[PDB]
Amino acid sequence: EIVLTQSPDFQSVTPKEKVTITCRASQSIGSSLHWYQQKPDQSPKLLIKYASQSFSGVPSRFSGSGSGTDFTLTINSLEAEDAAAYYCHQSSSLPFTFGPGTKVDIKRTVAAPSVFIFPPSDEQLKSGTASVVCLLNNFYPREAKVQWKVDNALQSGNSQESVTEQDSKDSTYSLSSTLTLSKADYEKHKVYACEVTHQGLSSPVTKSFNRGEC
């Protein structure tokens, strides 16, 4: 199977500026390469067919180009509605394949997250489990790092995190991180902390609490 690689994986663009996405095929495919746009919770839509032919209804600010193995999708004078994932697909040889996709989001000024931490509720503790939640609210860019520390020991493998889609009004993101322990394990330690690293923070921000406090 022909493998398609795309770059970059993520790109932020200021409205009116340009986005340039590239797709490379593991083997030559002539001009049998197409581009699709896909917004969150929506079906993909055809943008460019056969490398450079714009599909009906697609604005001229979109331009696809290339032949052989290297192809390019350029979005000139980007508008807000262009924030989406973009995928290339080759129809040169079976089995047909798609690139891994490229996410384009709206670029704005860096915004540090406001961090909040939540100890487990007495209700959950009673059920035998303790979930500690750390919220990083309204930040930009998307890249953020959360590290859990219990009595200053770095944790790994016992937390999961989720991130919202870019806000349509302030262009920010929010992220939740949950540390989960058994009730017994939770009661063996004193201090629980989440350490947040982000571009909007000159130094990492740590929010913490002593078990029993809030």
């Binding site: 199977e1 049998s32 197409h34 699709y36 896909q38 079906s43 993909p44 839509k45 055809l46 067919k49 056969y50 599909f55 994932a85 995928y87 697909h89 129809s91 079976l94 089995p95 047909f96 394949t97 798609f98 690139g99 891994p100 996709g101 406001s114 909040f116 931490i117 939540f118 100890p119 487990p120 509720s121 209700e123 959950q124 059920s127 979930s131 939640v133 919220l135 609210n137 999961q160 995190e161 989720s162 991130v163 919202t164 929010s174 992220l175 939740s176 949950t178 929010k207 609490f209 029993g212 406090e213 809030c214």
Partner: protein, 224 residues
């Protein structure tokens, strides 16, 4: 207008069979090739299979060849995907797509969700993420609720029966090692409102007919 409508999605245990279908309309079905493309949660598009306009030829992605069969009924304008020996990695949204002479996929359906898991339908336990000193930065307080251990997706979450929407952030669910999902919904409000307004997160889980309205009351853990 061209319209493609997929169906058949749902929860299926690993190793079992499931058939998806796609109703087509608005075009001469018998002269277009048809495809199936899927997308695993949070991942990219993956081509699955293609069937020629007359149904006399079919091709498959390496990952499903031998296990899936694509077929069509040109008298009923319907496309089918018979899936056998389902694996956890087959979990995805499956899209029906029309091709142009085996070229670009010009029209796509709305997709149907297939979840391959051994988990049993279960409603969530909802816990409060109470607003307190550790969750109040100045005049703004953060609060929310943890919707834990439910299956399958999805759950809906609203605040104060929908009256509260600004500042709300309901995060995408995460699949736990237990096979059950979990998600959190939070909202920021003025700290000045905590004493005169009750915050309730309304949680609904249709698959289990579960409805929970958890009050999220302020909490103090000070020795003062």
């Amino acid at each position: 207008q061209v319209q493609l409508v997929e169906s058949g999605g749902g929860v299926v245990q690993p190793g079992r069979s499931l058939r998806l279908s796609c109703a087509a309309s608005g075009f001469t079905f018998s002269v277009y090739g048809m495809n199936w493309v899927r997308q695993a949660p949070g991942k990219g598009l993956e081509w699955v299979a293609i069937i020629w306009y007359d149904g006399d030829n079919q091709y498959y992605a390496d990952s499903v060849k031998g296990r899936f069969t694509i077929s069509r009924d040109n008298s009923k304008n319907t496309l089918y995907l018979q899936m056998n020996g389902l694996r956890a990695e087959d979990t995805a949204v499956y899209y029906c797509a029309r091709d142009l002479r085996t070229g670009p996929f010009d029209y796509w359906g709305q997709g149907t969700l297939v979840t391959v898991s051994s988990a049993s339908t279960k409603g969530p336990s909802v816990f409060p993420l109470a607003p307190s000193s550790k969750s109040t930065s100045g005049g703004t307080a953060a609060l929310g609720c943890l919707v834990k251990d439910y299956f399958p997706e999805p759950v809906t979450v609203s605040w104060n029966s929908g009256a509260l929407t600004s500042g709300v952030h309901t995060f995408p669910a995460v699949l736990q090692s237990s096979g059950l999902y979990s998600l959190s919904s939070v909202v920021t409000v003025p700290s000045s409102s905590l004493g005169t307004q009750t915050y309730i997160c309304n949680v609904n889980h249709k698959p289990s007919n579960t409805k929970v309205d958890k009050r999220v009351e302020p909490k103090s853990c000070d020795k003062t």
